[PDB]
């Protein structure tokens, strides 16, 4: 079973807010430093994209990030309602089912 | 339509971007490894399509999005999101 999907459901330890944060390549390392502050509630999907399970209004996260990295920084924050994904890595798959619900 | 965010690993960036071209003005590239797509497509169908063309061991994530907030230097992304997202 390498194909998976989740409706990112709030119930139990899965918070209601499901966010996808994307930056530009040039800011990858700075966004990662910042995302690590959210602990086990985020995971890095690529050098420039993260998933965050947290009850935070997107515009508020945006103001927070711009205050730290600078107001001329490019970023995109989406509220997600589902995820469909594929991985070949057994270790990444268990992290992800847990993080996604 | 539906609002999708597609993310791959850095190793696959060139292959994904070639493939995302078929969606024309309905997609915009946000970074090397992330795209926004405005299209009426089932996410598992998009996923099966991608895996058939890039390889079945490829890592990918497809999110259905219900809102976006952004600040950007990329004129194509600003225009595509502000016009198509809703
Ligand atoms: Na939220
Ligand atoms: Na096809």
Numbering used by the authors:
A (entry chain A): -13 to 87
B (entry chain B): 2 to 87
Q: What do the study authors state?
A:
BPSL1038 is a protein with 88 amino acids encoded by a gene annotated as hypothetical in B. pseudomallei. The overall structure folded into a modified βαββαβα ferredoxin fold similar to known Cas2 nucleases. Functional analysis revealed that BPSL1038 is a nuclease with endonuclease activity towards double-stranded DNA. An active site with a unique D11(X20)SST motif was identified and proposed for BPSL1038 and its orthologs.
